[PDB]
């Protein structure tokens, strides 16, 4: 008698013990009120959401939702062990375009990136990965840089984080520490598996709905070609059966690669940083962050105004400050292009002040 | 107090009620032994398995496993969207190659193919669809024919089926009726969501592991261009696990089986008289007679491999010394042709004496 009850109790004990070590709570059920609060919070403009869709690859971008891949058609994995064949032998192992203000987050199963002979176990506070990842902006593209770990490069240790369940929304929250160039980062977790949106019918009960990626196609192409740019981590979610757990490796954009800015462009234009009050001549994370922040201070100044255009970049907008006399050029796609101080006593500066043509 | 307990009880009531209408049982938990029993049944040679991976597209083939796609990267969704538009106006609306004996099963969400503004409701015993699909063999390809329904082609009604839980394995079973040309068809259902195989570690509990598709890339390409329809709808739990989703499932035409295709049987039916078939009309019934007669030849104990057909490199010829018939099988296993040897003719005498057909 009760063989089924015994098996269920045994499953429940094993699940509770695994979840405890992994920092995992089973998804809740959602009242109407909860689901509304959860949907409000995930639809904020700067929200980054992880879905607990098991065994999935995800790419999230602020303002445009989450792209999900699951199944064998998630052979995207193999660019992630081709790389892992390649560390046998240059710290940048591989750059992968994902497609053509703005933050981004890429995540996939951590176990497929684990070290030689390694099984990642719940309870660990860090995991040594032979390859770490970083999202960057490379010439219009969102790209993933795969970096060989070791010593002379970037450490192998990746921190394991635990999410906090918000009892008001039924969502989870992971928080990343502040770094040079960026405040603490909140990442939302939708604990309900959601490979796509359920149709809003009587066949489903209320759940939060993660905004789904729309717009440009996500497609991985290998592109021809420091540790402060790394905000990557591992967290645990329930497995597909829902009774065990799986580790997920998560990678965020470099603080300096944000759509409006890229480290590449800041470096290219650092020659102008003296016009924004920066004396440093060395180019490093610290001074490029100074330059990025100086451009943001110029654009945020209440007396900075849109004034004219930069002929060479069709549809660019120029933002002028009448006190510092600085201009900053923004391309039509929103990318920072360049900036410098206007000389009002020179021909070209006089033409700009008079006509707006920079 | 107990606000969470009340919400959970209400969720459980709603789930049981929806599951009841849909014929759905929640997945079980598995002892080690149940998992081994389930894995043994799914590895039987002719097994066709559906996975209850929610909101997924799947392609299953005997002996090669299940291919799964879920997420946005289910873009072939729009294949079925495009035809649902093309239906405003030819019965055949599209033919989709899936890539280059052997049976096959293709499944996706049934709401994708319902009418616009149509919601499929649990409890229905059939569903009227504006398209139905058929799996075929077209020129080495496994392909999907999407057919407009209506008076002018094929009916719209698709049966809704319920799966039976096997308490010994923890798997479900769906059965399709026998038809002209095929016996009853057993379809296994792995009720545990499984977009891919869990790595066998201490982080997972025992569950049935469905064999996964290896081999040829599964890619969808449009191709230039009835008792062949064994399609149905069944329900599985949704991604949250607390509601249900309808799945539309299509099997291969009984005459399209890798070894045979309706197209090749039609092409070679001129030889059916050598296999004892007097009918001159070509239809499902007589093409099935021909298919069955070729199978009777290949199954005959006296039939032996003998020589080759050089015109098709690597082919094998199967000869029966009582009927004097030959059947030619291509190296990929496709039936090519067959006919009766005339031993008093030059080429028949050459074949008997040298194996050169």
């Amino acid at each position: 008698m009760h063989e089924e009850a015994v098996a269920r109790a045994e499953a429940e004990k094993a699940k509770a013990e695994l979840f405890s070590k992994a920092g995992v709570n089973q998804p809740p059920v959602y009242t109407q009120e909860m689901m509304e609060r959860a949907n409000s919070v995930m639809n904020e403009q700067g929200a980054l959401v992880l879905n607990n869709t098991a065994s999935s690859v995800q790419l999230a971008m602020t303002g445009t939702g989450v792209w999900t891949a699951a199944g064998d058609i998630a052979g995207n994995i193999s660019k992630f062990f081709s790389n892992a064949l390649e560390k046998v032998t240059s710290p940048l192992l591989m750059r992968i375009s994902l497609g053509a203000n703005l933050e981004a987050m890429f995540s996939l199963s951590a176990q497929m990136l684990a070290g030689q002979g390694v099984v990642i176990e719940p309870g660990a506070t860090s995991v040594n990965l032979p390859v770490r990842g970083q999202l960057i902006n490379s010439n219009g593209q969102l790209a993933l840089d795969l970096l060989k770990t070791g010593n002379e490069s970037i450490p192998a240790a990746v921190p394991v984080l635990n999410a906090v369940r918000d009892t008001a929304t039924g969502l989870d929250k992971i928080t990343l520490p502040a770094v040079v160039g960026a405040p603490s980062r909140t990442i939302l977790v939708n604990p309900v598996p959601q490979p796509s949106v359920p149709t809003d019918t009587g066949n489903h009960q209320p759940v939060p709905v993660t905004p789904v990626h729309t717009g440009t196609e996500v497609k991985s192409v290998e592109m021809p070609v420091d540790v402060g740019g790394l905000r990557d981590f591992i967290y645990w979610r329930p497995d597909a059966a829902g009774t065990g757990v799986e580790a997920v490796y998560v990678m965020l954009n470099d603080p300096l690669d944000s759509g409006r800015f890229s480290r590449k462009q800041l470096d290219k234009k650092y020659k102008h940083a003296g016009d924004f009050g920066i004396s440093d001549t060395k180019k490093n994370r610290e001074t490029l962050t100074k330059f990025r922040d100086a451009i943001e201070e110029h654009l945020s100044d209440k007396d900075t105004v849109e004034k004219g255009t930069y002929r060479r970049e069709k549809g660019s907008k120029v933002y002028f400050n009448p006190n510092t006399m600085n201009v900053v050029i923004i391309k039509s796609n929103g990318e920072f292009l360049s900036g410098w101080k206007i000389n009002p006593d020179a021909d070209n500066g006089r033409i700009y002040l008079e006509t707006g043509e920079l």
Side-chain angles (χ1 to χ4, degrees), chain A residues 100-148:
Chain A
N101 252 40
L102 180 278
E103 303 194 355
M105 180 173 61
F106 185 75
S107 58
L108 40 38
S109 289
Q111 181 55 47
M112 63 165 133
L113 319 178
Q116 184 282 328
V118 173
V119 176
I120 301 176
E121 323 174 60
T125 56
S126 62
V127 179
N128 279 8
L129 296 188
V131 177
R132 286 169 72 183
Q134 153 164 80
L135 282 175
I136 67 174
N137 293 171
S138 184
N139 225 65
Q141 320 252 0
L142 183 55
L144 181 63
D145 278 355
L146 297 189
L147 305 165
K148 183 29 199 142

Side-chain angles (χ1 to χ4, degrees), chain A residues 1-59:
Chain A
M1 298 176 63
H2 312 320
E3 289 75 16
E4 184 264 341
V6 171
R8 272 189 304 113
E10 289 175 337
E12 192 52 63
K13 173 172 171 163
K15 172 191 187 195
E17 286 179 339
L18 282 166
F19 279 24
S20 179
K21 298 183 231 192
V24 171
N25 290 284
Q26 79 173 358
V29 298
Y30 293 84
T31 63
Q32 186 77 33
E33 313 89 270
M34 286 172 68
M35 174 202 59
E36 299 213 66
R37 298 190 291 252
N39 284 343
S40 282
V41 160
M42 285 189 298
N43 278 273
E44 291 263 322
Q45 81 282 18
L48 285 170
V49 183
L50 292 159
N51 289 336
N52 277 181
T53 312
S55 296
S56 64
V57 178
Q58 291 171 37
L59 174 61

Side-chain angles (χ1 to χ4, degrees), chain A residues 60-242:
Chain A
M61 302 139 286
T62 54
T64 67
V66 176
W67 179 91
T68 300
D72 324 309
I73 204 67
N76 160 282
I77 51 172
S78 315
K79 320 168 127 51
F80 275 95
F81 200 103
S82 291
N83 55 9
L85 274 94
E86 268 196 337
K87 311 141 307 301
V88 286
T89 309
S90 169
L92 179 55
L93 294 166
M94 184 168 288
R95 171 162 315 184
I96 297 152
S97 174
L98 302 169
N101 252 40
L102 180 278
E103 303 194 355
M105 180 173 61
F106 185 75
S107 58
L108 40 38
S109 289
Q111 181 55 47
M112 63 165 133
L113 319 178
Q116 184 282 328
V118 173
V119 176
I120 301 176
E121 323 174 60
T125 56
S126 62
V127 179
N128 279 8
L129 296 188
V131 177
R132 286 169 72 183
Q134 153 164 80
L135 282 175
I136 67 174
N137 293 171
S138 184
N139 225 65
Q141 320 252 0
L142 183 55
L144 181 63
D145 278 355
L146 297 189
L147 305 165
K148 183 29 199 142
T149 70
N151 247 248
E152 290 300 60
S153 340
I154 67 191
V158 171
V160 179
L161 306 181
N162 297 138
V164 176
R165 168 73 43 90
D166 184 344
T167 54
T169 62
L171 301 173
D172 296 302
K173 182 164 147 174
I174 288 161
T175 59
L176 310 188
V179 298
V180 169
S184 311
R185 214 339 165 157
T186 294
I187 297 156
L188 299 175
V189 183
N190 185 346
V192 184
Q194 207 164 81
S196 39
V197 181
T199 317
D200 188 352
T201 67
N203 299 341
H204 307 286
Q205 302 205 46
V207 298
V209 171
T210 304
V212 174
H213 177 63
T214 41
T216 290
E217 308 62 40
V218 175
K219 67 201 142 312
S220 66
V221 184
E222 173 167 3
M223 285 180 84
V225 59
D226 65 271
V227 70
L230 292 192
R231 313 173 88 183
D232 51 330
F233 64 96
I234 291 167
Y235 84 113
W236 295 90
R237 61 185 169 210
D239 62 10

